[PDB]
């Protein structure tokens, strides 16, 4: 018992979406009922699971989910002649296992999240608006960065009609996924990222010298709102950062990006999509000053 316990709806959805991604899926659907309170279903056309690894499925995030909800999983592996449907108890044990015809892939159903922990379950219901918004940001993050991957999601309140949450088209480019997620009006107020060697004045302010900026292995790419008056946003609600295609919250990078923006638009925060490509062994960050230097210089060049 050394839990990696799913603390939230957003992390439950993150863990789930990443499994699909690690499974080499190209189509990942996410169905939610009552904002996930009643149902969180992640469907994926992936490699699926082989039958000699069923019992091992919970032996990890899936084991925690089981403990915190009623999990049902149907799956089929390329090597499989027929799919399989599995029902797990709260100890991650397989209750039932029956042949089930389905295409290659996996479908994970998390029914009634947190029901085993009354207290956490009510907190979930009371806070729902924030919990859900936190998940949407996580979801959007993966939608934007997953290129060549159709990611869809719908929400259903009670017996009402299904509502739209998001739907990308498997476009091979980030720019297109942004269009899919926030629509074409957002795109028009954006300019692509243009990287520049850190400038002398900026290196000066970051205590950097030639030797410091020579082995710069930072490759930055993405989009940002123009510095044009009004074009921005009213809050930081649409700012996405990634380090090696993985959603994250670099603290310093975030402030820096906003401040450099406020220099040209004191009254608004920008829309931000920023991926930072780096050498894994250099990750927290190893040469931050260089990066911040690169960012500031590059942003300044784009905004003037
Ligand atoms: N959607 C999925 N598609 C394929 N395999 C999956 C999926 N979800 C879980 N798995 C399998 O279950 C294993 C464990 O998942 P999980 O228990 O959450 O652990 P881990 O945190 O190591 O991914 C993975 O290594 C993978 O083989
Ligand atoms: Mg996992």
Ligand 1 probe mutation, 41, 48, 49, 64, most atoms within 8 A of CB: 49
Tokens of 218: 């930072």
3-state secondary structure of 164: strand
Tokens of 61: 């995030």
Ligand 1 probe mutation, 54, 62, 65, most atoms within 8 A of CB: 62
d(CA 177, CA 155): 20
Listed in sequence order, the residues at least 6 apart from 276 whose beta carbon sits closer than 8 Å to its beta carbon are: 218, 219, 220, 241, 242, 243, 244, 250, 253, 291
Tokens of 50: 């082989």
Domain ranges of the chain: 1-182, 183-303
β-bridge partners, 33 = 39, 156
Q: How crowded is residue 85: how many other Cβ atoms within 10 Å of its Cβ?
A: 16
Cα torsion 241, 275, 139, 2: sign: negative
Q: Comparing C-alpha atoms, which of 87, 104, 109 is closest to residue 31?
A: 109
d(CA 122, CA 300): 47
The second-level CATH assignment, the architecture, of 183-303 is: 2-Layer Sandwich (3.30)
Name the residues around ion ligand 2, CB cutoff 5 A.
Answer: 19, 61
**Secondary-structure class of domain 1-182 per CATH:** alpha beta
> 162-167 and 219-225 as β-strands: parallel, antiparallel, unpaired?
unpaired
> 70-76 and 105-111 as β-strands: parallel, antiparallel, unpaired?
antiparallel
Q: How crowded is residue 44: how many other Cβ atoms within 10 Å of its Cβ?
A: 27
Tokens of 116: 């085993």
Question: Is residue 198 a contact partner of residue 290, using CB atoms and an 8 Å limit?
Answer: yes
Give me the phi and psi of 221, to 5 degrees please.
Answer: -155, 150
Q: Provide the experimental method for this PDB entry.
A: X-ray
d(CA 255, CA 141): 19
CA 37 to centroid of ligand 1, rounded, Å:
23
Q: How crowded is residue 23: how many other Cβ atoms within 10 Å of its Cβ?
A: 17
Nearest ligand 1 atom to alpha carbon 15: 18
CA 59 to centroid of ligand 2, rounded, Å:
12
d(CA 100, CA 29): 19
In the block, residue with structure tokens 């990066």 = 291
Question: Is residue 107 a contact partner of residue 74, using CB atoms and an 8 Å limit?
Answer: yes
Instruction: Find the residues whose C-beta lies inside 6 A of ligand 1.
Output: 19-20, 23, 44, 46-49, 57, 60-63, 106
Nearest residue by C-alpha to atom 23 in ligand 1: 19
Q: Comparing C-alpha atoms, which of 195, 194, 189 is closest to residue 226?
A: 189
Listed in sequence order, the residues at least 6 apart from 75 whose beta carbon sits closer than 8 Å to its beta carbon are: 48, 49, 83, 84, 86, 102, 105, 106, 107
Q: Which helix (H) or strand (E) holds 94?
A: strand 94-99
Nearest ligand 1 atom to alpha carbon 61: 18
Q: Is 91 annotated as a binding residue?
A: no
Tokens of 109: 């159903």
């Amino acid at each position: 018992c050394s839990g990696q316990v799913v603390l939230s709806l957003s992390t439950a959805v993150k863990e789930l979406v990443e499994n699909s991604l690690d499974a080499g899926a190209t189509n990942i659907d996410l169905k939610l009922k009552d904002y996930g309170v009643d149902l969180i279903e992640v469907s994926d056309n992936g490699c699926g699971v082989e039958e000699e690894n069923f019992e091992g499925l919970t032996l990890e995030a899936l084991s925690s989910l089981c403990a915190l909800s009623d999990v049902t999983i149907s799956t089929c592996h390329a090597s499989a002649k027929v799919g399989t449907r599995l029902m797990f108890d709260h100890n991650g044990k397989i209750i039932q296992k029956t042949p089930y015809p389905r295409p290659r892939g996996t479908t994970v159903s998390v029914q009634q999240l947190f029901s085993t922990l009354p207290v956490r379950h009510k907190e979930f219901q009371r806070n729902i608006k924030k919990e859900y918004a936190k998940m949407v940001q996580v979801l959007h993050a993966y939608c934007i960065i997953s290129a060549g991957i159709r990611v869809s999601c719908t929400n259903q309140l009670g017996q009402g009609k299904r509502q739209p949450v998001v739907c990308t088209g498997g476009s091979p480019s980030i720019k297109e996924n942004i269009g899919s997620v926030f629509g074409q009006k957002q795109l028009q107020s954006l300019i692509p990222f243009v990287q520049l060697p850190p400038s002398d004045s900026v290196c000066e302010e970051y205590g950097l010298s030639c030797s410091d900026a020579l082995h710069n292995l930072f490759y930055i790419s993405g989009f940002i709102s123009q510095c044009t008056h009004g074009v921005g946003r009213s809050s930081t609600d649409r700012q996405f950062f990634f380090i090696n295609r993985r959603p994250c919250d670099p603290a310093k990078v975030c402030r820096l990006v906003n401040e450099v923006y406020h220099m040209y638009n004191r009254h608004q925060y920008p829309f931000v999509v920023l991926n930072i490509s780096v050498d894994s062994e250099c990750v927290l960050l190893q040469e931050e000053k260089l990066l911040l230097a690169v960012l500031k210089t590059s942003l300044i060049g784009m905004f003037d």
